[PDB]
Design an enzyme around this catalytic site. Structure first.
Site, short mmCIF file in Angstrom:
data_model
loop_
_atom_site.label_atom_id
_atom_site.label_comp_id
_atom_site.label_asym_id
_atom_site.label_seq_id
_atom_site.Cartn_x
_atom_site.Cartn_y
_atom_site.Cartn_z
N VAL A 103 -5.47 61.54 47.95
CA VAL A 103 -6.81 59.98 47.97
C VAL A 103 -6.30 58.90 48.72
CG1 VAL A 103 -8.27 59.32 47.01
CG2 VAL A 103 -7.46 61.41 46.28
N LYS A 133 -1.10 56.00 47.67
CA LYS A 133 -1.23 57.32 47.40
C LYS A 133 -2.04 58.43 46.18
CE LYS A 133 1.28 60.09 50.22
NZ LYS A 133 2.11 61.05 51.00
N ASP A 143 6.35 67.56 61.81
CA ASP A 143 5.05 67.55 62.13
C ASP A 143 5.43 65.93 62.96
OD1 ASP A 143 2.81 68.11 61.44
OD2 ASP A 143 3.05 66.16 59.88
N1 LIG Z 1 -3.96 61.21 60.02
C1 LIG Z 1 -3.42 60.07 59.85
C2 LIG Z 1 -2.57 59.29 58.80
C3 LIG Z 1 -2.54 57.70 59.41
C4 LIG Z 1 -2.20 57.19 58.15
C5 LIG Z 1 -1.37 57.10 56.92
C6 LIG Z 1 -1.08 56.64 56.13
C7 LIG Z 1 -0.48 54.87 56.13
C8 LIG Z 1 0.54 54.32 55.70
C9 LIG Z 1 0.77 53.31 55.39
N2 LIG Z 1 -0.26 52.24 55.52
C10 LIG Z 1 -1.54 52.72 55.93
C11 LIG Z 1 -2.00 54.03 56.05
C12 LIG Z 1 -0.01 57.30 55.34
C13 LIG Z 1 0.34 57.61 53.53
C14 LIG Z 1 2.16 58.24 53.84
C15 LIG Z 1 2.90 57.36 52.25
C16 LIG Z 1 1.68 56.90 52.02
F1 LIG Z 1 2.88 56.51 50.84
C17 LIG Z 1 0.94 56.00 51.64
C18 LIG Z 1 0.02 56.41 52.87
N3 LIG Z 1 -0.28 58.83 55.38
N4 LIG Z 1 -1.79 58.26 56.59
C19 LIG Z 1 -1.43 59.61 57.37
#
Ligand SMILES: N#Cc1ccc2c(-c3ccncc3)c(-c3ccc(F)cc3)nn2c1
Ligand SMILES: [Cl-]
Ligand SMILES: [Cl-]
Length: 306
Positions: A21, A37, A127
């Site tokens: 989430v 996250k 990845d």
């Molecule tokens: N398909 C897809 C997809 C798109 C965007 C996205 C983000 C994201 C990162 C920064 N800002 C906004 C969104 C993350 C993520 C990764 C680590 C974290 F600690 C918190 C979020 N995963 N991720 C997956």
């Protein structure tokens, strides 16, 4: 309570799927937005705590977001890092599922720099996908610069002290996205630096062509589907992929496919190879991207694009 990690207030949810989430957030001390996250406590696969460490190792590297907090509040594990903009896949759909040659080249040299800096820190990404390469937010100094997130599949490929490469092995499980993964990954071989760059080469042709010839393949199961995709990759020459495109992209893919297992790839040579495309076409590397012309010049917006 509305605040997690002492200083971070929750906000809009931006995701809830393959990586937990994910919410929008705001630092309550300075107002700077963050990405929060959420991952449950007892899960089958604990990948967050190692991701926080990966951001801490790659801390200070340009294009890698800063890690601010890792906690255990309630039955959830929490990671707070910078909030970034849309992914390259998002900007790809908004530009009509095709990037210009100039955009691909300028994006490719930033992606190569990002992946290189990860390799300098003794890690391979494993990845590679346009969904994990994100731009910045509006008004920021890195608004249209490429970033790299999501290091849950990263693995150390060499000792951080002796610089000894991991041994070569096979019979490994096919994990990743079949559309971009290297041929060696389809064969269950151990991944190394060459496989991150080959996957980039697939994305570059993906951006240029709007599709890959191994998309939309059918098979009874997923294992046979991954095999048909890998079979098409070994059946399609790089020049065939580069039909009507600057041949430096085929030259790039054939080069990274020919790298030895433990070899250090020539990153700057590959960047100079792709930059020569702009010289042949009389274009400048000024940083002007296709998505910057969206919506009459405003750029991407929320209501219309997504
Ligand atoms: N398909 C897809 C997809 C798109 C965007 C996205 C983000 C994201 C990162 C920064 N800002 C906004 C969104 C993350 C993520 C990764 C680590 C974290 F600690 C918190 C979020 N995963 N991720 C997956
Ligand atoms: Cl693994
Ligand atoms: Cl597909």
């Amino acid at each position: 309570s509305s605040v997690v990690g002492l200083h971070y207030k929750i906000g809009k949810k931006i995701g809830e799927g393959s990586f937990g989430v994910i919410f929008e957030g705001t630092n309550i001390i300075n107002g700077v937005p963050v990405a929060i996250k959420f991952e449950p406590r007892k899960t089958e696969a604990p990948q967050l705590r190692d991701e926080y460490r990966t951001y801490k190792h790659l801390q200070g590297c340009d294009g890698i977001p800063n890690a601010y907090y890792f906690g255990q509040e309630g039955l959830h594990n929490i990671l707070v890092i910078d909030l970034l903009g849309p992914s390259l896949e998002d900007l790809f759909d908004w530009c009509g599922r095709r990037f210009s040659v100039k955009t691909v080249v300028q994006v490719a040299i930033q992606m190569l720099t990002l992946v290189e800096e990860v390799h300098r820190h003794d890690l391979i990404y494993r990845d590679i996908k346009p969904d994990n390469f994100l731009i910045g937010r509006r008004g920021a100094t890195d608004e249209n610069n490429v970033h790299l997130i999501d290091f849950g599949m990263a693995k150390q490929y060499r000792d951080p002290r002796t610089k000894q490469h991991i041994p070569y092995r096979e019979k490994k499980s096919l994990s990743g996205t079949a559309r971009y993964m290297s041929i060696n990954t389809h064969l269950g071989r151990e991944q190394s630096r060459r496989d991150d760059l080959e996957a980039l080469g697939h994305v570059f042709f993906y951006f240029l062509r709007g599709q890959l010839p191994w998309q939309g393949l059918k098979a009874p199961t997923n294992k046979q589907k991954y095999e048909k995709i890998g079979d098409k990759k070994r059946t399609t020459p790089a020049v065939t992929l580069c039909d009507g495109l600057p041949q430096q992209f085929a030259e790039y893919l054939d080069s990274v496919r020919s790298l030895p297992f433990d070899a250090e790839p020539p990153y700057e040579e590959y960047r100079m190879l792709l930059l020569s495309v702009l010289d042949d076409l009389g274009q400048a590397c000024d940083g002007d991207m296709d998505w910057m012309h969206l919506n009459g010049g405003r750029g991407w917006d929320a209501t219309i694009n997504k």
